[PDB]
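Follow-up to my post from last week.
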Amino acid sequence: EVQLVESGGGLVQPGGSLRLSCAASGFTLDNYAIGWFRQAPGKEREGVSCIGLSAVTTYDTDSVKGRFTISRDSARNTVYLQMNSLRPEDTAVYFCAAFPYSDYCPDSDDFLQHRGHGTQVTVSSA
Amino acid sequence: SDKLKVVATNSIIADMTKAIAGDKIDLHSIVPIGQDPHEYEPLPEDVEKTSNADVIFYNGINLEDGGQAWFTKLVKNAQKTKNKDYFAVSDGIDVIYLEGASEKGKEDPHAWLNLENGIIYSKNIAKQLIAKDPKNKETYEKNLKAYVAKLEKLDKEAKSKFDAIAENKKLIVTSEGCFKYFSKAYGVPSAYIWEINTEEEGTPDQISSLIEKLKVIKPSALFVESSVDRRPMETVSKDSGIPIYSEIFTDSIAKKGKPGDSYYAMMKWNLDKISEGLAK
Ligand SMILES: [Zn+2]
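User reply:
Got it. Predicted complex:
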């Protein structure tokens, strides 16, 4: 029933910023943590930002701390990822996922039940 | 930067510390997720982390302390000083005592299932974090203010959570008698197999004394804690026909990203699952 749809990705110049959105079209969204994750070719899944059901924010990937910020608009049932100073190493499919009755997001070795299709972010100069 | 080295005895206290400190400290939790925190053998990493810690937090009130208890031995071997090196985060709560005759009036440690006591725990933690790491005092007070406000809102919700249940099926049944503070704060009586985890866990007489109570007062659900063996309550579920509606969180939080993976989340889970279970 929990449905998540991302938006806001694409081709972006190195150094620039991008804001991703995660639109939640299930309900009782206030009782879920929402995490942003990414998957780059040949790498493990990284949880890059998380906001828990209590609104606490956590950042499980050191290489994006200070550049990424997660926020929740409860009225809109949307979670935003603000990415800054983007690097070639940030190129990945970015996807959001929902975790019922959680304040935190799983580590890479945990399975992931409710997630969106994902949105490509490619950091390069065309 | 040279972060403060903190050690907490279990995952509940560690999570409350994390809610106050964020990523500003170096935090070690001794009792692993899902394990009983009343009796535990520290590992070499635990003894080492405890010796090097700048501040140690424990529950107190007869959870891990007292004569020959595991934490007492730990801090005595490390030559630590009470209220200089290690602090009972329960200081200031209104203690409730064990009722069984064999427990000789000892304290019941499970204060944190009353959210107002969770607020007291968090204030004690923030006090010592600020006193020993003043450079991060601004973060500590901002997190403390925000966290206490969230716990207060959940406490308000807890005080009305069971108003639709008839005072004939208001019975929280768990394996350990760990709900005394919850029962007192929120007006839902509780029953158990064994009163505290250090007793024998699931003897014929315990199970039968509970089954007789489940004949007088007959709730729509039983619950099993994440940190106990399920077999005694499954037996109680057999002989009573009452289903185990869900697992609940008492002595441990869950793993990161699972339901109940923080103090706040485990209490929201408990409030929702217990009220939904008792209404079925
Ligand atoms: Zn216990």
